[PDB]
């Protein structure tokens, strides 16, 4: 059922590490995440996986 | 600095590097930070992008 109930809530980050060549390249696609980074935001993991 | 230019100062150019965090001055656009090849397309009247 938990399994269930994680398949339906579609996460926006799916894992909190992005390094700097993944943006460099594919900079042809206009990511959401990449351009929050180039700008100073970010966002912090939870305390509890 | 919004459209293709050909009535220049005195300044002399230097070669292009690529992939190093760099000061630019790109016809007069100066700025700073690292250049890599692009597969954007552009028209003949367009010389920016934002």
């Given at each position: 059922i938990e399994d269930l109930l994680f398949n339906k809530v579609?996460?926006?980050d799916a894992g909190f590490m992005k390094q700097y060549g993944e943006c460099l390249g594919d900079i042809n696609a206009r990511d959401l995440?990449?351009?929050?980074?180039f700008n100073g935001l970010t966002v912090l993991p939870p305390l509890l996986t | 600095l919004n459209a293709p230019a050909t009535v220049?100062?005195?300044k002399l150019s230097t070669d292009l590097i690529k992939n190093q965090c760099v000061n630019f001055n790109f016809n007069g656009l100066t700025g700073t930070?690292?250049?890599?090849?692009?597969?954007?397309?552009?028209?003949?009247?367009?010389?920016?992008?934002?």
């Open positions: 579609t996460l926006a995440i990449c351009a929050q980074k | 220049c100062g005195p930070g690292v250049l890599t090849p692009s597969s954007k397309r552009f028209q003949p009247f367009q010389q920016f992008g934002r």
